[PDB]
Symmetry: C2
Subunit: 202 residues, 2 copies
Amino acid sequence: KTLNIYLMRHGKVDAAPGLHGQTDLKVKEAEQQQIAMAWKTKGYDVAGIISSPLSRCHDLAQILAEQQLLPMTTEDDLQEMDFGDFDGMPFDLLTEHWKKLDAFWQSPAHHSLPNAESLSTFSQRVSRAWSQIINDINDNLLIVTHGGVIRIILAHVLGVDWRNPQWYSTLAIGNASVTHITITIDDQIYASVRSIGVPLVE
Amino acid sequence: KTLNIYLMRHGKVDAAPGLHGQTDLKVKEAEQQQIAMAWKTKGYDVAGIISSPLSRCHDLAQILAEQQLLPMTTEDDLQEMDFGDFDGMPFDLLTEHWKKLDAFWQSPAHHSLPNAESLSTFSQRVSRAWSQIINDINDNLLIVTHGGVIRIILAHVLGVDWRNPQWYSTLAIGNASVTHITITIDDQIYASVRSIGVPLVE
């Protein structure tokens, strides 16, 4: 038997583009309905939802859960990166402040934004949660999470180095995008990425 | 000033009569029309079509070209690897006592099949063509090609190592799958992989 994992990004955060980290950015009510109606009428088969604690994810997961009568939980390791000091700020307000994040994007191997989680810490807790999820899994699960989290999971499964800055620089995974990963279980565990970044609505 | 590149893979190849009484792997004619209708009704807008000259890619590109009245060209650097252009080459028992390309799945360049291209040649000839494509480009582009080709394009753009065997092993890109790369031209070329492997029907 083979099982289906669907990683979904939360949807556009009704905000100026910035560092949408662990600050609780809220998306619109009608926006979550769009995504939920899309997911249902596209006919996705899932038997359990794992969510990020944050509202943009959780609020949608919740709507889906009582839409299709399914078990739902949150996992705190599947929050996006804590940026610390700059966390939640729009990019235009960071012109006023420090131009040091360009050295973070250039090489996140040796940069952390003063009060931030490092990529080292972030990829640790993401892959640690991922390895547990694939070992605990029966039937199909939806994971409502963030793009940065999905990127690490795809880096792990495809076996590309998490240190590579280009991977986060160039791999845009959109809002309300289901990225299909399939696991196949017999002796020891095997995973293959089907279709990544597939949109649902706008 | 920002441009869309749609890398498509050809549809599902089934057994069909070919040249001189041989059995070919041809894409079913009605199944080609299903891809054509799906590309049209999904409303992908595009200026030109660059196809692989090979059998299954070229046919679809042809139908698409006169469906929406678009300029079409083949490009001989966008074909398969050419896994071995062998004839007799006393492969009387030599291809028989050969676990056929057991090191294409294993390594970058420690094997060949005394007729073929290595990964080093195949990557270089694709990326050279890709670089020529991204510099020539004005307006939107559909590239009808092969899964092998698309994988190296992504490897170059995402800055990942193409020597990695898992990149071909675990990364799937299905038949009739549009993968979206947007390039944006300024001082240099700036490419971001949007969606990858988005299918149309079965």
